[PDB]
Design a protein around this nucleic acid. Structure first.
Lengths: 177, 88, 46, 153
RNA sequence: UGAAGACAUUGUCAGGUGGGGAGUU
């Protein structure tokens, strides 16, 4: 386990800036004085407390499996991909928000992209390819993805048209059981 | 269309300097950005790049002064760390 | 109820650490905010 | 053309008062500033929202009234219809004024000069300035149903 | 000489980890 370098943290924070607003809130000292840091273990980024990460040093490298909340993995080509295990962090400070109905939440959890007839609420003034976080009508976070068109463009859409490409949904927890 | 990383292209000295070039196929020594001040200065450029064009001249200046102040505070911490390393 | 008052004197300990030279008066308020924090803490479990 | 020349002389007097920090005059300046900012150029709207930020930081260095005056003026700028439709284009974020209003509520309860005996900014007492600030934050005329509940709580 | 105070800090052993630093193949 090692912390990120200059190149790795630029890539990680670039992916987080696509989906969130208050990125300085994440790197901010709390009441006790400790901070939240980033750790890398086996090509995987963990968003964990510094006090937790300091007392996890005594675990051997091969013998350590997880730490706090896993954001995602860095691939072989160097890109950083976000996972659904980062969704509570994304939902806390989501920039653009889309709400789906009960007839659209179940297709999303199976792995489908959001269709126009599934949407129950939009966020005004959303650009074309922006990072949105998907909720249901009960304000339960379901996943995140990228919008297909702008909000003004998607209001005129035929209701079988795609309004948000799916990237992660919380049915991935059923995959690893 | 192919990537410059795969081709063995030498680095060229421009107005942007080349700096000290690490040899190919050897240890590119990792420098860590665990420090919060070093985390803030990287965060300032990420937020500035995503925001883009601002019509206001004053708000465009404040977007740059935030990056400048982040660089100054990080440099003061690194100089104090260098002084502590020189003492040790 | 108490919370606006302790945070008021916490600023006051900051200015005297930076006014008068009343170390005896300064020490008496230190015990006073140590009291108010403790009874605030000790009531949160009930 | 005449409106351009009058707006230059009117706004120059406004900004020279804000620089000189005349207390009784700058209450009236913010009323004129909130009334007439939508006539002036689009680029200067974000400058006014940033000059108000610099004033609030200067009082943070009586002083409760100046900060609440500039806070209600910023909310009165985005109150207007044309400025509200330009939140996305003109990057006008009121997050500074919301957060500075939140951090000053404990200190405002302690200070005892909160009640001293048809405009919007130039009100006399600090309490009704606080009331009009919270009315803007918690009960906005636009998007009153799309308010973050965590900010409400 | 004023202030804090038997709590920190510090020191010695025995350990854990060490993708960072220095040496050998």
């Amino acid at each position: 386990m090692r912390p990120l370098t200059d190149q790795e943290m630029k890539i990680v924070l670039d992916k987080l800036a696509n989906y969130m607003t208050d990125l300085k809130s994440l790197i901010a000292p709390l009441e006790d004085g400790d901070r939240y840091v980033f750790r890398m273990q086996k090509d995987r980024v963990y968003y964990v407390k510094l006090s937790i990460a300091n007392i996890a040093t005594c675990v051997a490298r091969d013998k350590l499996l997880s730490l706090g909340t896993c954001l995602g993995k860095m691939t072989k080509s160097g890109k950083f991909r976000l996972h659904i295990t980062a969704l509570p962090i994304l939902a806390q400070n989501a920039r653009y928000k889309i709400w789906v109905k009960d007839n659209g939440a179940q297709p999303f959890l199976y792995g489908s992209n959001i269709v126009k007839a599934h949407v129950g609420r939009w966020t005004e003034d959303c650009p074309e390819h922006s990072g949105c976080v998907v909720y249901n009508m009960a304000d339960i976070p379901l996943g995140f993805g990228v919008t297909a068109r702008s909000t003004a463009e998607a209001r005129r859409l035929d209701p079988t048209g795609i309004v948000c490409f799916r990237q992660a949904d919380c049915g991935e927890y059923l995959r690893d059981e | 269309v192919y990537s410059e990383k795969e081709l063995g292209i030498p680095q060229l000295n421009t107005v942007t300097p080349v700096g000290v070039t690490k040899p190919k196929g050897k240890k590119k020594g990792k420098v860590f950005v665990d420090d919060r001040e070093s985390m803030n200065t990287i965060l300032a450029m990420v937020e500035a790049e995503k925001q883009g064009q601002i019509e206001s001249k004053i708000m465009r200046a404040r977007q740059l002064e935030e990056i400048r102040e982040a660089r100054r505070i990080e440099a003061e911490k690194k100089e104090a760390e260098r002084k502590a390393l020189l003492e040790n | 109820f108490a919370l606006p008052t302790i945070v008021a004197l916490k600023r006051w300990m900051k200015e005297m650490r930076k006014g008068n030279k009343n170390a005896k008066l300064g020490s008496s308020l230190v015990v006073l905010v140590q009291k108010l924090e403790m009874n605030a803490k000790f009531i949160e479990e009930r | 053309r005449i409106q351009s020349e009058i707006l230059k002389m009117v706004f120059a007097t406004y900004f020279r008062i804000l620089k000189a920090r005349v207390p009784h005059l700058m209450g009236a300046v913010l009323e004129g500033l909130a009334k007439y900012a939508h006539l002036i150029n689009q680029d200067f709207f974000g400058d006014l929202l940033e000059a108000l930020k610099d004033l609030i930081r200067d009082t943070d260095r009586d002083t409760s009234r100046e900060s609440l005056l500039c806070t209600v003026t910023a909310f009165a700028l985005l109150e207007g219809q044309d400025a509200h439709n330009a939140r996305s284009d003109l990057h006008l974020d009121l997050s500074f004024f919301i957060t500075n209003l939140y951090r000053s509520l404990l200190s405002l309860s302690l200070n005892p000069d909160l009640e001293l005996g048809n405009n919007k900014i130039n009100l006399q007492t600090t309490t009704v300035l606080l009331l009009r600030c919270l009315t803007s934050v918690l009960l906005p005329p636009w998007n009153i149903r799309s308010v973050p509940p965590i900010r409400l709580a």
